Write a protein that binds this ligand. Structure first.
Ligand code: 0L1
Length: 194
């Protein structure tokens, strides 16, 4: 019943970080923007790359923060505040350690699960965790101590391919996502194998 008005894709700015696992979410928004013919404009007042397309009479915005992963919320808060977009009208695409590559899932509310981008968005939205997430699986190296080095790595070829497959699966269910029909979106998404 609540239509999506902001899609955020999380990532780190700069060449050293391009195409790393931690940029899965920004990759998703980048594919979305290309599929829709939407230009991503560098806008200083939103600390990121911003885009716009129309859907059912409403303005749907795309956002890739150009702050570091850990200050993403200042970008999300800046755009959500200017346009009075409530938490539940926001979708955040992000890498997910808890699912292997090729798998993508939707979720409404909850923890930040250790993810520093998510954590900053929950914090900056005046502690609202109410938003929806597209969790794009990237695997887990095996030990908590390895996590930092792993998300900042470029995945091997087979894994980048499975990521691409899952992003494609997730663009498949865009109509349902934009509409706010989360159960239908889940049913369709959560049944596809890479
Ligand atoms: O939680 C994840 O899926 C991986 C991100 C690692 C946590 C971080 O963003 O600080």
């Amino acid at each position: 019943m609540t239509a999506v008005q902001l899609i955020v894709g999380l990532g780190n700015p700069g060449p050293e970080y391009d195409q790393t696992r931690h940029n899965a979410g920004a990759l998703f928004v980048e594919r979305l923007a290309h599929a829709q013919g939407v230009s991503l404009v560098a806008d200083r007042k939103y600390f990121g790359l911003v885009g716009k397309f129309s859907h059912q009479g409403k303005d749907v915005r795309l956002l890739i923060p150009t702050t570091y992963m850990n200050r993403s919320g200042q970008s999300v808060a800046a755009l959500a505040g200017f346009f009075r977009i409530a938490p539940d009208a926001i979708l955040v695409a992000h890498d997910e350690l808890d699912m292997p590559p090729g798998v993508a899932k939707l979720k409404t509310g909850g923890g930040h699960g250790g993810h520093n981008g998510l954590r900053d968005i929950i914090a900056q939205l005046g502690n609202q965790n109410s938003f929806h997430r597209l969790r794009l699986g990237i695997g887990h190296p095996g030990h908590s101590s390895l996590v930092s080095g792993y998300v900042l790595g470029r995945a091997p070829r087979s894994e980048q391919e499975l990521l691409d497959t899952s992003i494609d699966f997730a663009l498949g269910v865009l109509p349902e996502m934009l509409a706010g029909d989360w159960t239908r979106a889940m049913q369709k998404l959560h049944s596809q194998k890479a």
